[PDB]
Design a protein around this ligand. Structure first.
Ligand SMILES: c1ccc2c(-c3nc(N4CCC4)c4ccsc4n3)cncc2c1
Ligand code: NA
Lengths: 305, 306
């Protein structure tokens, strides 16, 4: 029993984290085979950061400008190129700890684990969802840039996020590992703000299923609803629309608990309308939306790595 | 900025997790140097569960009765002994991935990370506190026994918990790595129940300081309190008493924010009285009690957002 925000074990990623220094700027890199991936903004100073010309800044740099440290060892950079907003530093040694891996782009609503690092040194691990507004509610201090997000699908690490910056509201923005930003953000210092965010409906339902599996059942009711009526309600409360695909994905949980998805939707309708009347669900007084259907099935089964 | 329940990176522990089988029972063990540590109840049968005589069950075992598997490799057990409620299996290979480590016994209120494992295979990592009633509110399924809790300060892994069992209320009980149970519990299936649990007051205060550091001031008030009046009120909401030690421990956060500990205590009093009236603190609608003073200083800026 029990239900916790749970990250993937981080060991396979820990063995890939290095420190990258350019000029006065030091941040984290991801060393896979013979390439170190990091944010391109490592080449900037403060005044470059106002209006950086990355191509121009980069052409001016030599390999030896980039100091790459794997624990105590310096690696030798033998090449450097850019792909979108990520810098690729070719190094002379392949990482002997390189895991089976792929680069994947995730969709808003999906979760992943973040290994937060400072000076190439992993300090913490936590589980996040990509918000509908393409931010993540992370916990990041100065020196955290180049920290990465991932999932583990078997023995294979899917890398999905690299951290680039914090927004004024204290939430975080970054790229996939091909250097494409999540969200309408740029790696410069201009005014930038997160859009208004929405709740991930399908995830809330998943978490309500988790609650039921853990014996917490007071919010269930005799009523069912339709997708359309529910969605009329959801929209009003700044909830993402629930699609047929979402319903299908909850199928397993529905079968296991004996509560159909539109049955559970009627519960969620009531919770949005009435509140929780002083009660909690899985110890929480708000509806949790950072667990996917997959996460719930995983944690309420015991799949391992 | 941001404030998240954060676990320690689990890699140093992942390299120590093995599978231990005795009879039809399989669970997890922790392989450090040339010793594998696991719950002694691995040697129990169906009969044994109420009133196992561990000494008697153990004497009847030989080394080769214990199958230890480290990934693909079988390890050869060359010795076995019991220490309190943990079994120590001497093996013929030292773990080349042994980190710098120590065994520490923690006190209620302390936090740690749990690496949940099944069949010697790591499944997930989460952050926990030792509850005042000496349980932990974990996430554990059958096969999880021998999963461990730990801290990593600097390069050193401090092992503080090994998982033994789930209590009827769905909370968890286990030992330190010297096999001594936390709380009044025993590794038997007789009736036992956790004491009524309380909120970890000092941790809540720490978290309120974290909120102030992260720029939130709405729940502060002009009042102070005496320690004793604070405790009189706190007790009524099932909060642990705050001691002078707890006050001293909050000193650094007090200094950094300019809010005296008893000033912050008065804020907590009011919060308990009023609730949050539709607001959140650091994204929570309840008061969080699973961050220690140390955790807050660790995770937070050293400059407060005024
Ligand atoms: C349900 C069910 C079991 C849970 C366990 C558990 N219990 C166990 N025994 C009780 C008597 C033997 C065992 C034995 C080997 S592995 C294991 N694992 C641990 N944690 C949570 C749980 C929840
Ligand atoms: Na219903």
């Amino acid at each position: 029993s029990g239900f916790r925000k749970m990250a993937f074990p981080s060991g396979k990623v820990e063995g890939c984290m290095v420190q990258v220094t350019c000029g006065t700027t030091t941040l984290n890199g991801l060393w896979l085979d013979d390439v170190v991936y990091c944010p391109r903004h490592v080449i900037c100073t403060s005044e470059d950061m106002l209006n950086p010309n990355y191509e121009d800044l980069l052409i001016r740099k030599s390999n030896h400008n980039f100091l790459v440290q794997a624990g105590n060892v310096q690696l030798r950079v033998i090449g450097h190129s850019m792909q979108n907003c990520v810098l690729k530093l070719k190094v002379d040694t392949a990482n002997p700890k390189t895991p089976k891996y792929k680069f994947v782009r995730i969709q808003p609503g999906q979760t992943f684990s973040v290994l937060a690092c400072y000076n190439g040194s992993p300090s913490g691990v936590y589980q996040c969802a990509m918000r509908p507004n393409f931010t993540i509610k992370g916990s990041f201090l100065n020196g955290s840039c180049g920290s990465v997000g991932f999932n583990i699908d078997y023995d294979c690490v899917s890398f999905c996020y690299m951290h680039h910056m914090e927004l004024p509201t204290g939430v975080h923005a970054g790229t996939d590992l091909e250097g494409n930003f999540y969200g309408p953000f740029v790696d410069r210092q201009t005014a930038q703000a997160a859009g208004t965010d929405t709740t991930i409906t399908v995830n809330v339902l998943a978490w309500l299923y988790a609650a039921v599996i853990n014996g917490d059942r007071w919010f269930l009711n005799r009523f069912t609803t339709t997708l359309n009526d529910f969605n009329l309600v959801a929209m009003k409360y700044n909830y993402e629309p629930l699609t047929q695909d979402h319903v299908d994905i909850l199928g397993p949980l529905s079968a296991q608990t004996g509560i159909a998805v539109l049955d559970m939707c009627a519960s969620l309708k009531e919770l949005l309308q009435n509140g929780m009347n002083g009660r909690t669900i899985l110890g929480s007084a708000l509806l949790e939306d950072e667990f996917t259907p997959f996460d719930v099935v995983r944690q309420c089964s015991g799949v391992t790595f």
